[PDB]
């Protein structure tokens, strides 16, 4: 059991000195095997007296499920909901009592009848378990009741705690793909290295691209210099530009610390030192072949530099294209394809394959902007193209609900009882 | 301008101020556009299709007119402005300063009856080469005028 | 380079009926992109409205929304400008008439009252609809909105 | 009677007493409250010690006008912001117990070498009743006259408190000031703003205020108060149909019925609000209160045209648009606006809210005033409101001609013993 | 508005200053009190009547 591990490694590092022999401690493998073995998994979760829903129990199977309905039957509801219980793990995890999203005043019932909103929810995590409710009264009324944290602030702990021993602790992921995915051609036509940058600060819903563009560029940077070496000494030219930064520094001045700053960090490359199998060649490889699965009609995709810029080339039949003049349905392929990808490749420095995390997926109309044809083999592909995730997708195309296993399928239905209509689920 | 009446003596000043906005920008570099008339001040009368203003200016013996009218949405009849006389005046200056250095340009001002709110902000309202094309920037007062004063003083 | 001859033709054309005509009509032109899911429920108080403000661009983009709104409360609030004034004297007419016709219709009918009710009741309402607020359609208003 | 004796008396049954129903029937809550109505809040003495420009002054004012005449630079504004600061202090306890007011700042006392303090007393009266304030601030290195001495301003605090907490629709004192450029509740219900300080020439605000009252005033016209006029509409034709127009147990029945189409008619006026304060009697009596300030113009409307909508003013036989005016009159038609609304929105119990009580300091009132206006402005404002103090400053001789000289000031400061000292002659 | 904020005395002395210390530059003037009226000559003044 988790809790077992971690009660005796806290006891044992709270009555004992020497950190050093800490870290060596049998503790710390045994919390890390144990930790790594456990699975991410969000097995139910009961919705009361919100929105539409009046009382709601779900329970979500461990690798698909697909919600369908017709118009005005509470899909995003679903979404929202959970996006609201995952908001107060992800700030307890990045700060120590960090607030969380609340629940707004209109969100709750109109009716005259309802007084409070609650959601609540489950996580399972091997044979370790946690609760979470968060509830919202109406206004003006007596009663206030308050909402449980101390399973979030259990679950965090454990984490923080094995990052803090050992730098590569991986994390999970959650992520949340609105409609907001459109716009300014999803991000077209509108540095990155920490590990906390995807993660904490970073919100679950998108904004912007660009960072996967500078992303791609330190990418290419670092894949010519290391793997295709053409660098020599590249820790001593580092080093003597760090030195000659200082010197012209000395004989925009906050600029100048920032520039000599980050030369010294590159200067530090002799200091990482990995040149292992999964090197920056390696990972350009994985990425765009990873990206081109999903366009079967391009041929391949190329970084250009010309008049001191850098520009994103495609090939397509015999005619070269470059990013702006593509359609939409192909730009919001790249895109979220793009994004899911650098997530995963960020937030997992260890696995030999990075494409082998843990975490969750919402995803809001799959199916905009795609012809049949491409409906009919994307939710297959994603599926096998990144196994270990929980992927939860809402539609209403009979075309992407006809190759959906009849396991994974929920339907809602409005059914008036007593003379008020309630919101239902039902299989197949 | 003494006796008061409906149209408002504001006006004339706020005419006269859009001719002469159009001295300053041609001296300042050539064929530089000025302050249009707004189509939501032409008159509303149903008679009325376009509006215009005209003025002299005499030099000595030399004699320039200006011009300036626009008409109204889905006219007929188009009308643009006539600005020969103002470029061929402003070259003189512009080739004056050209050749010979420290030269002196014209001055235009307007003081408005909000320079008691601009003004008024001496409480606490909270470079270094005084140039001469500083000054030809604006024509009205406003507030960052005495907060340029204090730092030239 | 372009040409440009046909369309200024057709264009001084209907610049020029506009010229002798009080309600001349123009053509209508429209489109609307992909990015008006943007505008899915995402000014110095205007006064005065024109025909020649949906000619500022043939694309229905961002702030069309805002104007809408403002453009139909002032449309009702026109209706209620006519929903008063003499409009309701002829309305306290008719409903007394009525009134008064049921009062008839009651008493066990009481010529004499029903005679005067009738010609009363005739007479005002004759007299109210032969105006008809000018034209009838012509007073919009009500109608535009409903 | 003293008002003190009888605020007395009635807090000490208040207390004693239990079954509030019959305290508020006791004779005692209607004494006290008859008692405060017939009242006049008026200030009686001011003294300064060492604001600004002046040391050392005892100025006495009247109750109808103070007109304070003299050029720049002779303290004709510092006495304003003095009865201004004493104000903020009253209204700040009425709002809430041992609420702080307007303090002084730094720079506004003396800067003379010799000086350690600066303060301000005043004395207000009602009746038979008197109070006095006395606000202290030292510089540095000294000591203040003892402290902020204001144990007597929360007496009277407390009397209209205690009042307004049983007794709705009360009446309260009228505190304003119009300045210079510088820069739940029935005030938040509509759009009011509760301040002291206002500002002139903001027509554009007070235009839209006016519009969106009209907006709603038109909006509660409809609905519900229709089926009541259509009920009231029949039934008189009703009544009609069976006495007066049917002469140009039948009789017990159509009697019964008319009795009781009156008793629902008078149930279904009785059940709601009365008229209190609504967008109707609102509209309607500022438009009155400005018509009566300019009778040189008949009616004014909203008029909502076939592409547009303005307001319309009738003069002689002209029809002139609100903005056709000029300055001059676009100053005061705020300045009343403003007065009346404040005015009415204090006064919900008379019949004529006109009648109030409160003082009103006005300073520099000739801006942007045509000299036919300066004729008879002091004229028109003391006649629309009769029982208002007003404290005015005058800067031209236009206006000052006017004035009687029971109620002038003048300031020609002499220098006693070689030291600028502001001196007041009658 | 020249005579805003200004007391008479200082009122009558204006226009002198104003044409003596810089007796090169045209000057348009809106006035509205007598005082100022009184001191300006009469080939000066422009009368705007409806
Ligand atoms: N406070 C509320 N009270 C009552 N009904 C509400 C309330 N809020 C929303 N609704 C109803 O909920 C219905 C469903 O809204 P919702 O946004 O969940 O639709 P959806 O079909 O899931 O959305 P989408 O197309 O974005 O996936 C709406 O038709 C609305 O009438
Ligand atoms: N701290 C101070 N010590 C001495 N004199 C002061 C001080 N502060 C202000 N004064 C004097 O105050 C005078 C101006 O006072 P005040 O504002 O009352 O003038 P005013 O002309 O009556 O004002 P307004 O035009 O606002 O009616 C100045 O002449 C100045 O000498």
Same mark, same amino acid.
């Given at each position: 059991?988790?809790?077992?591990?971690?009660?005796?490694?806290?006891?044992?590092?709270?009555?004992?000195? *020497?950190?050093?022999?800490?870290?060596?401690?049998?503790?710390?493998?045994?919390?890390?095997?144990?930790?790594?073995?456990?699975?991410?998994?969000?097995?139910?979760?009961?919705?009361?007296?919100?929105?539409?829903?009046?009382?709601?129990?779900?329970?979500?199977?461990?690798?698909?499920?697909?919600?369908?309905?017709?118009?005005?039957?509470?899909?995003?509801?679903?979404?929202?909901?959970?996006?609201?219980?995952?908001?107060?793990?992800?700030?307890?995890?990045?700060?120590?009592?960090?607030?969380?999203?609340?629940?707004?005043?209109?969100?709750?019932?109109?009716?005259?009848?309802?007084?409070?909103?609650?959601?609540?929810?489950?996580?399972?995590?091997?044979?370790?378990?946690?609760?979470?409710?968060?509830?919202?009264?109406?206004?003006?009324? &007596?009663?206030?009741?308050?909402?449980?944290?101390?399973?979030?602030?259990?679950?965090?702990?454990? &984490?923080?705690?094995?990052?803090?021993?050992?730098?590569?602790?991986?994390?999970?992921?959650?992520? &949340?793909?609105?409609?907001?995915?459109?716009?300014?051609?999803?991000?077209?036509?509108?540095?990155?290295?920490?590990?906390?940058?995807?993660?904490?600060?970073?919100?679950?819903?998108?904004?912007?691209?660009?960072?996967?563009?500078?992303?791609?560029?330190?990418?290419? *940077?670092?894949?010519?210099?290391?793997?295709?070496?053409?660098?020599?000494?590249?820790?001593?030219?580092?080093?003597?530009?760090?030195?000659?930064?200082?010197?012209?520094?000395?004989?925009?001045?906050?600029?100048?610390?920032?520039?000599?700053?980050?030369?010294?960090?590159?200067?530090?490359?002799?200091?990482?030192?990995?040149?292992?199998?999964?090197?920056?060649?390696?990972?350009?490889?994985?990425?765009?072949?990873?990206?081109?699965?999903?366009?079967?009609?391009?041929?391949?995709?190329?970084?250009?530099?010309?008049?001191?810029? &850098?520009?994103?080339?495609?090939?397509k039949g015999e005619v070269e294209l470059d990013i702006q003049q593509l359609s939409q349905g192909?730009?919001?392929?790249?895109?979220?394809?793009?994004?899911?990808?650098?997530?995963?490749?960020?937030?997992?420095?260890?696995?030999?394959?990075?494409?082998?995390?843990?975490?969750?997926?919402?995803?809001?109309?799959?199916?905009?902007?795609?012809?049949?044809?491409?409906?009919?083999?994307?939710?297959?592909?994603?599926?096998?193209?990144?196994?270990?995730?929980?992927?939860?997708?809402?539609?209403?195309?009979?075309?992407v609900l006809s190759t959906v296993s009849s396991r994974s399928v929920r339907i809602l239905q409005?059914?008036?009882?007593?003379?008020? *209509?309630?919101?239902?689920?039902?299989?197949? | 301008?003494?006796?008061?009446?409906?149209?408002?003596?504001?006006?004339?000043?706020?005419?006269?101020?859009?001719?002469?906005?159009?001295?300053?920008?041609?001296?300042? =570099?050539?064929? =530089?556009?000025?302050?249009?008339? =707004?189509?939501?001040?032409?008159?509303?009368?149903?008679?009325?299709?376009?509006?215009?203003?005209?003025?002299?200016?005499?030099?000595?013996?030399?004699?320039?007119?200006?011009?300036?009218?626009?008409? =109204?949405?889905?006219?007929?009849?188009?009308?643009?402005?006539?600005?020969?006389?103002?470029?061929?005046?402003?070259?003189?200056?512009?080739?004056?300063?050209?050749?010979?250095?420290?030269?002196?340009?014209?001055?235009?001002?307007?003081?408005?009856?909000?320079?008691?709110?601009?003004?008024?902000?001496?409480?606490?309202?909270?470079?270094?080469?005084?140039?001469?094309?500083?000054?030809?920037?604006?024509?009205?007062?406003?507030?960052?005028?005495?907060?340029?004063?204090?730092?030239?003083? | 380079?372009?040409?440009?001859?046909?369309? %200024? %033709?057709?264009?001084?054309?209907?610049?020029?009926?506009?010229?002798?005509?009080?309600?001349?009509?123009?053509?209508?032109?429209?489109?609307?992109?992909?990015?008006?899911?943007?505008?899915?429920?995402?000014?110095?108080?205007?006064?005065?409205?024109?025909?020649?403000?949906?000619?500022?661009?043939?694309?229905?983009?961002?702030?069309?929304?805002?104007?809408?709104?403002?453009?139909?409360?002032?449309?009702?609030?026109?209706?209620?400008?006519?929903?008063?004034?003499?409009?309701?004297?002829?309305?306290?007419?008719?409903?007394?008439?009525?009134?008064?016709? %049921?009062?008839?219709?009651?008493?066990?009918?009481?010529?004499?009252?029903?005679?005067?009710?009738?010609?009363?009741?005739?007479?005002?309402?004759?007299?109210?609809?032969?105006?008809?607020?000018?034209?009838? %359609?012509?007073?919009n208003a009500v109608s535009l909105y409903d």
């Open positions: 059991n988790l809790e077992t591990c971690y009660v005796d490694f806290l006891e044992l590092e709270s009555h004992v000195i *020497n950190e050093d022999y800490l870290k060596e401690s049998v503790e710390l493998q045994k919390l890390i095997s144990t930790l790594n073995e456990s699975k991410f998994h969000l097995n139910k979760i009961g919705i009361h007296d919100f929105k539409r829903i009046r009382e709601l129990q779900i329970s979500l199977e461990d690798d698909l499920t697909v919600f369908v309905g017709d118009n005005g039957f509470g899909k995003s509801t679903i979404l929202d909901a959970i996006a609201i219980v995952l908001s107060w793990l992800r700030s307890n995890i990045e700060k120590e009592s960090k607030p969380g999203t609340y629940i707004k005043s209109h969100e709750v019932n109109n009716s005259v009848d309802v007084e409070y909103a609650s959601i609540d929810a489950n996580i399972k995590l091997k044979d370790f378990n946690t609760s979470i409710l968060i509830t919202k009264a109406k206004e003006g009324a &007596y009663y206030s009741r308050n909402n449980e944290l101390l399973g979030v602030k259990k679950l965090a702990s454990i &984490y923080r705690l094995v990052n803090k021993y050992v730098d590569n602790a991986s994390l999970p992921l959650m992520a &949340y793909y609105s409609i907001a995915r459109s716009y300014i051609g999803g991000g077209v036509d509108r540095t990155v290295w920490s590990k906390f940058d995807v993660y904490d600060e970073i919100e679950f819903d998108r904004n912007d691209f660009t960072d996967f563009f500078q992303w791609l560029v330190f990418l290419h *940077n670092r894949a010519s210099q290391e793997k295709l070496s053409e660098s020599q000494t590249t820790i001593n030219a580092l080093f003597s530009d760090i030195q000659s930064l200082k010197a012209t520094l000395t004989q925009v001045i906050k600029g100048l610390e920032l520039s000599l700053k980050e030369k010294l960090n590159y200067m530090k490359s002799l200091q990482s030192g990995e040149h292992k199998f999964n090197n920056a060649v390696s990972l350009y490889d994985s990425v765009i072949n990873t990206i081109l699965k999903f366009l079967p009609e391009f041929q391949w995709i190329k970084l250009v530099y010309g008049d001191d810029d &850098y520009k994103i080339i495609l090939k192909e730009k919001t392929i790249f895109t979220l394809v793009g994004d899911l990808a650098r997530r995963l490749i960020l937030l997992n420095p260890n696995l030999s394959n990075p494409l082998l995390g843990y975490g969750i997926v919402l995803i809001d109309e799959i199916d905009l902007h795609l012809h049949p044809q491409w409906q009919q083999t994307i939710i297959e592909r994603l599926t096998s193209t990144f196994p270990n995730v929980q992927f939860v997708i809402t539609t209403h195309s009979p075309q409005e059914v008036e009882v007593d003379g008020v *209509n309630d919101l239902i689920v039902s299989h197949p | 301008f003494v006796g008061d009446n409906g149209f408002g003596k504001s006006t004339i000043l706020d005419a006269i101020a859009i001719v002469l906005s159009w001295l300053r920008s041609n001296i300042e =570099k050539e064929s =530089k556009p000025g302050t249009y008339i =707004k189509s939501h001040e032409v008159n509303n009368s149903v008679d009325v299709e376009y509006a215009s203003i005209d003025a002299n200016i005499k030099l000595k013996d030399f004699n320039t007119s200006i011009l300036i009218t626009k008409a =109204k949405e889905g006219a007929y009849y188009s009308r643009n402005n006539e600005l020969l006389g103002v470029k061929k005046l402003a070259s003189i200056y512009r080739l004056v300063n050209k050749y010979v250095d420290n030269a002196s340009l014209p001055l235009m001002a307007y003081y408005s009856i909000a320079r008691s709110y601009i003004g008024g902000g001496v409480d606490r309202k909270r470079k270094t080469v005084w140039s001469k094309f500083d000054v030809y920037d604006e024509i009205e007062f406003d507030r960052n005028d005495f907060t340029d004063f204090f730092q030239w003083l | 380079n372009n040409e440009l001859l046909g369309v %200024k %033709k057709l264009a001084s054309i209907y610049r020029l009926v506009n010229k002798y005509v009080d309600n001349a009509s123009l053509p209508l032109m429209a489109y609307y992109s992909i990015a008006r899911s943007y505008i899915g429920g995402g000014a110095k108080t205007k006064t005065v409205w024109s025909k020649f403000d949906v000619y500022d661009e043939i694309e229905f983009d961002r702030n069309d929304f805002t104007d809408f709104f403002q453009w139909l409360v002032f449309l009702h609030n026109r209706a209620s400008q006519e929903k008063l004034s003499e409009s309701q004297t002829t309305i306290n007419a008719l409903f007394s008439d009525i009134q008064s016709l %049921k009062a008839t219709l009651t008493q066990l009918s009481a010529s004499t009252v029903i005679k005067g009710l009738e010609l009363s009741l005739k007479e005002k309402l004759n007299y109210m609809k032969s105006l008809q607020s000018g034209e009838h %359609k012509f007073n």
